[PDB]
Amino acid sequence: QVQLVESGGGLVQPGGSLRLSCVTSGFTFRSYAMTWVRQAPGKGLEWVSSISHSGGSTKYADSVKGRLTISRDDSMDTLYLQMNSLRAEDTAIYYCAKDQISYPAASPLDYWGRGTLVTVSSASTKGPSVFPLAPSSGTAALGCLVKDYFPEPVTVSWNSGALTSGVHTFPAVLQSSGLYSLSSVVTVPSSSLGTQTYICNVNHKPSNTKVDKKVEP
Amino acid sequence: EIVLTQSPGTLSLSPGERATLSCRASQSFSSFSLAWYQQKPGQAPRLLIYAPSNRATGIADRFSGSGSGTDFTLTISRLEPEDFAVYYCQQYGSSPITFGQGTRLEIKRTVAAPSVFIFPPSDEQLKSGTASVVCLLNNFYPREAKVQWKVDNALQSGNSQESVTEQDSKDSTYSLSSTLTLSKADYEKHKLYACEVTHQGLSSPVTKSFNRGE
Ligand SMILES: [Cl-]
Ligand SMILES: [Li+]
Ligand code: NA
């Protein structure tokens, strides 16, 4: 039951700092090298840094040397990444990963965390507006337009998770305004319209915006 | 550094078929220094095979690795719907660690025409001062699709954006949204809003439209 869970990401201004952490369980942490890998939105994997089991040997990608520092606390089973002087191009999901051996950057990465999103931008946090996509006047489509938010991510569910069949939640699009928008849609029986309640549940944790919106004809 | 280039960028295959994914290196190196990872959307990569063809925990025997020198191959026999993902190769025998750019394995399925829906801006949005018209193309294949917007028969060029889902887990289709942005004034000052969809599964383009205020 290896577990790796990252935290510390979020929106930060260029030149700013973040301290990422990865708490672990289910393996003898002090015995293994550990690694950070990042993935810019829509792009591939890029190795960032690795640290030996003892912390005595560290390795860095050239693009991050001197700005990012890897460290570990064996007594806390935690890996860290201290990020300073951040740049727009450091925007990425940051994954922590366990190496197979005690030496850094010299073996496969056998377990990975789900990652923490780091957004480096001068734009301010902004919560979305939630607008209905009402079903038209035997299947009907309806949805919610989640408009004008920053940074990513937004999540959408329907009927608090009870409605999953026929749901399509689209990837966000960056608008020319610099704000994101997405839509979530669902197809339902026309006969259900006006009787079955359809609610889209929108969460934008970066702005602590949470909305449940009834979508009606 | 060792550059790793994967090919093809996207591989479209039917379930039951054999996939051959290639990873080519700018310098020759040992098969014992190569690993492959599988990444599904919204998830982290997972170790697949390594050094050269040891399987990570939970990985089916249908995944195998071969090659030497500069040309390496991941073979997936009898593709199952779950094995569709982005695949990355990685070398760890020479500093710095490097990754291939990824190959996306897409599920080939039978051509399916989109069902098309159009949505006017909500009164709430107009009250807030903006207008978005949405065109939905539901459950189609292949991904290629043209959406043309017209307002009072004027072709709209440059003021729409599109977004496409990942392939559906159950039927391997795509869905697509196209959103037309127009000022509230432009919305209220024109009448007929139309989205016209061209797609391989349609014998001729389909148009969905509405008249504002009708
Ligand atoms: Cl070392
Ligand atoms: Li806000
Ligand atoms: Na068209």
Numbering used by the authors:
A (entry chain A): 1 to 137, 143 to 222
B (entry chain B): 2 to 215
List sentences from the manuscript.
One of these proteins, which had been independently discovered as GNA1870 and LP2086, was found to bind FH and renamed Factor H binding protein (FHbp). In the present study, we show that two vaccine-elicited antibody fragments (Fabs) isolated from different human subjects increase binding of complement FH to meningococcal FHbp by ELISA.
In the structure of the FHbp complex, CDR-L1 has five disordered residues, which are ordered in the Fab alone. CDR-L2 shows a backbone shift of up to 3 Å between the two structures.
